[PDB]
Amino acid sequence: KLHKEPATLIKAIDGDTVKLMYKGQPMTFRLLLVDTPETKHPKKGVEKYGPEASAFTKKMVENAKKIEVEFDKGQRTDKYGRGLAYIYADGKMVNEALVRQGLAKVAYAYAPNNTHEQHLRKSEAQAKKEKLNIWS
Numbered sequence: 242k243l244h245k246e247p248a249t250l251i252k253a254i255d256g257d258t259v260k261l262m263y264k265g266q267p268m269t270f271r272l273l274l275v276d277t278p279e280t281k282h283p284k285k286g287v288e289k290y291g292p293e294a295s296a297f298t299k300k301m302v303e304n305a306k307k308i309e310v311e312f313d314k315g316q317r318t319d320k321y322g323r324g325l326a327y328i329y330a331d332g333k334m335v336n337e338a339l340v341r342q343g344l345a346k347v348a349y350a351y352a353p354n355n356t357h358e359q360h361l362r363k364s365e366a367q368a369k370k371e372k373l374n375i376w377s
Contacts, residue, residue: 245309250302255281256294271323272336275345294344305330314353340364343373
């Protein structure tokens, strides 16, 4: 079973990346299962809807009174040392909120880190049907 743990916002970095205080140590978190247009993309820099996605994530975590991180079942850090998790702001999953708004696509999932994949894909299908942002 997945478990939610408390954390404290330090700084929102990009639409798919936020730095948090987790267990007394500052750490960069990469949002599991979602790909957002980037503003700090290593090859393109700023893509379309990139500023929109970053703003959405930033506002969501900054306005939250309780932030929680939920690791999946596989590895918990990627090769760059970023934690891999589902992030919740006052009980709402940021990863899902971005996909539901058409500000993120569901990324290629790798078991065992794919527990909420079907949930996310369902929100993505709804965002496509509504032709929101990325899907218009």
